[PDB]
């Protein structure tokens, strides 16, 4: 507190940490979704939800409490009978198309990362990226 708050030593991992740059020497960070245990758990939860959704009845109308103003005469069709059925179908199908969304997302991410050094200014303009792109084109 009173004295120098840094106290650099000859470790370079405490020295780098004390000045802010700690994770900046590792390739990729540490995350939670990278373990098979959490993956199995998430898959279990998703399968349970899909099971519950599929065990619903097909005839799943909804009484909307605003049908009062629509003077239904036992022959007309209520304009809101399919509102919980539509939501159930939407959730079920969205849960069944998860891998497709994952694939499209990873395609987008890869095709936007591969062009980082060409589309992002502060990466394209550093002397090191420019030097590397020049070094590749040496005839």
């Amino acid at each position: 507190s009173e004295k120098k708050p840094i106290k650099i030593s000859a470790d370079f991992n405490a020295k780098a940490k004390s000045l802010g740059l700690e994770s900046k020497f590792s390739n990729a960070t540490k995350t939670a979704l990278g373990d098979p245990d959490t993956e199995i758990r998430i898959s279990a939860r998703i399968s349970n939800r899909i099971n519950e959704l599929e065990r619903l009845p097909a005839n799943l109308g909804t009484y909307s409490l605003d049908d009062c103003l629509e003077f239904i005469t036992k022959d007309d069709l209520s304009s809101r009978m399919d509102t919980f059925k539509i939501k159930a179908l939407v959730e079920l199908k969205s849960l069944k198309l998860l891998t497709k969304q994952k694939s499209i997302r990873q395609k987008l991410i890869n095709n936007v990362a591969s062009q980082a050094h060409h589309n992002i200014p502060y990466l394209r303009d550093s002397p090191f990226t420019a030097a590397a792109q020049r070094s590749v084109q040496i005839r």
């Binding site: 708050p5 000045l19 802010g20 740059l21």
Partner: peptide
């Protein structure tokens, strides 16, 4: 990494003055 923000602000204030 919060100390370096104060350090940068101090250096900028140094650049503001003349007889410093």
């Amino acid at each position: 990494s919060k100390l370096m923000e104060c350090v940068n602000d101090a250096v900028q204030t140094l650049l503001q003055g003349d007889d410093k």
